[PDB]
Amino acid sequence: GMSSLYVFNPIFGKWSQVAPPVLKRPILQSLLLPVMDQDYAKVLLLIDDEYKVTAFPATRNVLRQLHELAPSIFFYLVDAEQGRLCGYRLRKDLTTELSWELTIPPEVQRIVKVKGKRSSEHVHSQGRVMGDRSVLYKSLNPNLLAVVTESTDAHHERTFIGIFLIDGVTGRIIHSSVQKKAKGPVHIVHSENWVVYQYWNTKARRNEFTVLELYEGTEQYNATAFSSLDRPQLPQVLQQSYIFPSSISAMEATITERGITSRHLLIGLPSGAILSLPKALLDPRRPEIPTEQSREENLIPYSPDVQIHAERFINYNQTVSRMRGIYTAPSGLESTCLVVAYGLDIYQ
Amino acid sequence: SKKLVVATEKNVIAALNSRTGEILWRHVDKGTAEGAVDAMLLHGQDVITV
Amino acid sequence: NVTNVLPMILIGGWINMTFSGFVTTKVPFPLTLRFKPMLQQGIE
Amino acid sequence: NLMGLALAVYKCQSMGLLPTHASDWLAFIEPPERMEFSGGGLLL
Amino acid sequence: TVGLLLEHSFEIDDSANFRKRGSLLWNQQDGTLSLSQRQLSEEERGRLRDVAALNGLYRVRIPRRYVSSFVPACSLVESHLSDQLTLHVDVAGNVVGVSVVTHPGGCRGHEVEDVDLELFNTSVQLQPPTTAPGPETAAFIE
Amino acid sequence: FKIEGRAVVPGVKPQDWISAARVLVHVGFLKSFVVHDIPSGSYVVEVVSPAYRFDPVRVDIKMRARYVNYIKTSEVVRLPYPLQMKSSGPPSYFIKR
Ligand SMILES: *[C@@H]1O[C@H](CO)[C@@H](O)[C@H](O)[C@H]1NC(C)=O
Ligand SMILES: *[C@@H]1O[C@H](CO)[C@@H](O)[C@H](O)[C@H]1NC(C)=O
Ligand SMILES: *[C@@H]1O[C@H](CO)[C@@H](O)[C@H](O)[C@H]1NC(C)=O
């Protein structure tokens, strides 16, 4: 359980002069806390196993900043062994008082993975213009997180996959869903106000996609602040489920600052090829024998058997073998994304 | 002739060119431990893998 | 009138057929939205 | 005289085509300011 | 049927001195939830207002048969003890979590006059997990 | 159990691209085409290539591969015997102007 902190300069490859502090205890987790110091450095809070915090650039200035704004900083921790979640908050001094707590029975549910929004994103539009020049506002909730579980009693009549959407601060479940007859290794994306997860159906022996969107309503509730200790009313979930003709490996979403341009989904097939899929094709609000509003809204009814044609494959003959992962980074031009596929063999 | 052969941990088999690091053929089979090699032998033109 | 207008309306077409697939500049006063599809004319 | 007919045309075209209203006002919104901060994840 | 204990707390220093605040009565057979409550003594009222004057927290706790949650005191006592509980469970039946939220909104500061708050105009509902729909093959067909 | 197969190209002198085949579904390699030591069920195989296309086949092993369509589980198009694939030229990943 020991832990070590190595600090350096990524340009030339050298250790820096400042020596890091010596960790005595097993570390659990860490966050980055973009607030700065007088030298333009983030602060990197680390949490001990005895629930004590350490702040790496521990200067006086940072400490007064913290003695001011500590109670707006919350940690969340998760252990899959016994299946329990916990959430702590700071104090004026650096300690932690348990705030919320939550369990899951480890005999019918076994956590697989946990996701949270990338902090380094910016979103342009707070609303979606409806057909008749109306507006549908969307619920963002920075501090949200998605949790995915699967069963223990694996047998292809009684298998099920579980989803939970939580707030990190309070510990209240927005949504709690179950998709039966599905077991497989899952693949998830949790972006600005939407969620996608891929799984495998044992009752028609085929892969599948499922998509979620969150919309609050027609009006705005404290449009300027969004404190998560003030929203009683929970939003309305939309969702939908499509099928997919193949298997999957690492999946990711594009990114660029200012969030303007359309967002795609980068899929890693098993054959090594990559696929770019438009998010606007996976929309739960799809006419389904259209009215004229949907017709105007050009919502492309309910595409059957979402298709695969080799005209949108990035890697023509540059296949990557195993493709355990993908990384997407933003340029400064706002029309390009920089892609890196890592497996047994690199691509860029 | 120009070449050498390896058999790695990642279950791969390669046929590198012995003038510059470059591959002629990989035959990667299986990440997980049901293709892991246990022996290797060269009969002067061919190979043998277990 | 005709002589005035026409060699001005024939050239806009040439341009928008030539310099089509990109953006040019920004006007510092907010405009109305319905007029979008004819001010950009290449963009998707 | 001219005022009346002019504004009548204005009002009719607003009543069917023009007005600056909600959808148009949408793009004049700065985004909210996150007040609370949550970071963490698995237990490494 | 089953019963469930329920504790509550609020202090000046955000400590834990959980005490009982009535019990829940849950029918397994058919989903039904009911509360049995006692109304506040006056010393608790005073302490609670002194808390709300500091943006402290009202904390609630129940057992697994643990689980907790919290909400500011201001957004509660400015609402004349209007609150709401949700009790989330699993597919097979086990307590999973507990949420306590007030109606409406948050703090403005306006005085309550401190005679309203002996009612506990509360409300409870459980909610199990919603299933999720298949891919609606009909429109896929035509 | 096992899966026999032939994997042919019309006139392209196979041997070269044998250096870059890895059949998935359990993984197999080329000579012709064989996959040893599997269980029995409804498995869909394809012949991977980075510069070629090969339509998949849905075996339902006694061997019978009927068709892959993914919409209507119950369907039989009775493909005779093992994984003839027709090597449908080069796939077009490039796009003109
Ligand atoms: C909005 O939130 C801010 C910060 O929490 C608060 O100061 C303001 O009073 C709120 N206004 C409304 C209308 O909710
Ligand atoms: C990849 O394929 C394209 C055509 O499909 C071909 O032009 C190119 O030379 C190939 N690359 C390599 C390295 O063989
Ligand atoms: C009790 O809850 C209802 C729910 O709408 C609310 O109308 C009522 O005002 C609440 N009671 C008090 C005393 O606020």
Structure tokens at F95: 């796009």
Break chain B down into helix, strand, coil percent, rounded to 5: 0, 25, 75
Pairing relationship of beta strands A135-138 and A206-217 according to DSSP bridges: antiparallel
Burial of E59 (0-12, 13-18, 19+ CB in 10 A): buried
Alpha-carbon gap, residue A151 to A159, rounded angstroms: 6
The chains in contact with chain C, meaning 3 or more Cβ pairs closer than 8 Å, are D
Alpha-carbon gap, residue F45 to F47, rounded angstroms: 7
Alpha-carbon gap, residue A174 to A195, rounded angstroms: 13
Q: What is the signed CA dihedral for B42, B43, B46, B48, rounded to 10 degrees? A: -60
Ligand 2, atom 6: closest residue by C-alpha = A317
Give me the amino acid identity at A52.
K
DSSP A208-260: EEEEEEEEEESS-SSTTT--TTS--S--EEEEEEEEESS--EEEEE---TT--
Q: Give the other-Cβ count within 10 Å of E102's Cβ.
A: 22
The structure's method of determination equals cryo-EM
Please check whether residue E117 is in contact with residue E46, taking contact to mean a CB–CB distance below 8 angstroms. no
Which residues partner with E124 through β-bridges? E85
Give me the amino acid identity at D44.
L
Preceding amide of E104 cis, omega within 30: yes
As a whole number of Å, the end-to-end CA separation of chain D is 79
Nearest of A248, A175, A263 to residue A208 by alpha carbon? A248
Question: Measured on CA atoms in the order F96, F50, F48, A204, is the torsion positive or negative?
Answer: negative
Where b means 16+ CB within 10 Å and e means fewer, C2-31 reads eeeeeeeeeeeeeeeeeeeeeeeeeeeeee
Structure tokens at A261: 């341009």
Please check whether residue D38 is in contact with residue A74, taking contact to mean a CB–CB distance below 8 angstroms. yes
| Residue B46 region by backbone torsions, left for phi larger than 0, else alpha for psi between -120 and 50, else beta | beta
Q: For D1-44, list the strands marked E by DSSP.
A: 37-42
Alpha-carbon gap, residue F1 to A24, rounded angstroms: 56
Residues D37, A77: C-beta atoms closer than 8 Å: no
Break chain F down into helix, strand, coil percent, rounded to 5: 5, 20, 75
As a whole number of Å, the end-to-end CA separation of chain C is 35
Alpha-carbon gap, residue A204 to F68, rounded angstroms: 12
E13 backbone dihedrals φ, ψ, rounded to 5° = -115, 15
Structure tokens at A238: 């939309």
Q: Is A340 helix (H, G, I), strand (E, B) or coil?
A: strand
Alpha-carbon gap, residue A250 to A239, rounded angstroms: 22
* A1 interfaces chain F, CB cutoff of 8 Å: no
Burial of A154 (0-12, 13-18, 19+ CB in 10 A): exposed
Residues A243, E135: C-beta atoms closer than 8 Å: yes
Nearest of A110, A103, A98 to residue A152 by alpha carbon? A110
Q: Is B18 helix (H, G, I), strand (E, B) or coil?
A: coil
Give me the amino acid identity at D11.
K
Nearest of A144, A186, A190 to residue A162 by alpha carbon? A186
The chains in contact with chain A, meaning 3 or more Cβ pairs closer than 8 Å, are B, D, E, F
Residues of B in contact with F27 (CB under 8 A): 29-30, 35
Q: Give the other-Cβ count within 10 Å of A330's Cβ.
A: 17
- The experimental resolution of this structure, in angstroms, equals 3.4
Residues of A in contact with B28 (CB under 8 A): 321, 344
Chain F interface residues facing chain B, Cβ-Cβ under 8 Å?
Answer: 19-20, 22, 27, 29
Pairing relationship of beta strands D37-42 and A73-79 according to DSSP bridges: parallel
Q: For chain E, list the strands marked E by DSSP.
A: 2-9, 19-27, 32-36, 57-62, 67-72, 83-89, 95-102, 124-127, 130-131
Residues with CB under 6 A from ligand 3: E 79-80, 82, 119, 121
Pairing relationship of beta strands A249-253 and E130-131 according to DSSP bridges: unpaired
Q: Give the other-Cβ count within 10 Å of A62's Cβ.
A: 19
Please check whether residue F52 is in contact with residue F62, taking contact to mean a CB–CB distance below 8 angstroms. no
Give me the amino acid identity at A262.
S
Nearest of E66, E74, E70 to residue E99 by alpha carbon? E70
Please check whether residue E48 is in contact with residue E79, taking contact to mean a CB–CB distance below 8 angstroms. no
Angle at A289 between CA A283 and CA A290, to 5 degrees: 70
**Contacts (Cβ under 8 Å, ≥6 apart) of A192:** A117, A121, A123, A140, A259
* Residue to substitute in F49, F93, F95, F96 for testing ligand 2 pocket (most ligand atoms within 8 angstroms of CB): F93
